[PDB]
Amino acid sequence: LRKKIEEVGMPEAVKTKALKELDRLERMQQGSPEATVARTYLDWLTEVPW
Amino acid sequence: LRKKIEEVGMPEAVKTKALKELDRLERMQQGSPEATVARTYLDWLTEVPW
Numbered sequence: 150l151r152k153k154i155e156e157v158g159m160p161e162a163v164k165t166k167a168l169k170e171l172d173r174l175e176r177m178q179q180g181s182p183e184a185t186v187a188r189t190y191l192d193w194l195t196e197v198p199w
Numbered sequence: 200l201r202k203k204i205e206e207v208g209m210p211e212a213v214k215t216k217a218l219k220e221l222d223r224l225e226r227m228q229q230g231s232p233e234a235t236v237a238r239t240y241l242d243w244l245t246e247v248p249w
Contacts, residue, residue: 179223180233 208249
């Protein structure tokens with residue numbers, strides 16, 4: 150995702166929101182009830198057109 | 200469950216979705232409340248006709 154996110158487009162508050170999940174490292178390979186929401190969140194963040 | 204996921208069906212995104220949860224239930228043996236959720240989810244997912 151850090152390959153995916155530094156590409157063309159996004160503004161800089163988007164980048165400050167984009168550096169959120171570097172230290173959201175380990176809760177998705179085991180658990181958690183709200184772990185794929187951040188995965189999906191930055192998927193949505195890199196998915197919308199710019 | 201590995202065999203039955205591999206034979207019947209499935210669409211490929213669904214098969215990746217199922218295999219990324221089948222390895223995540225390494226928490227078994229008198230618990231957890233999270234193991235019995237995922238095991239019946241995989242039991243429902245391999246009995247619906249694809």
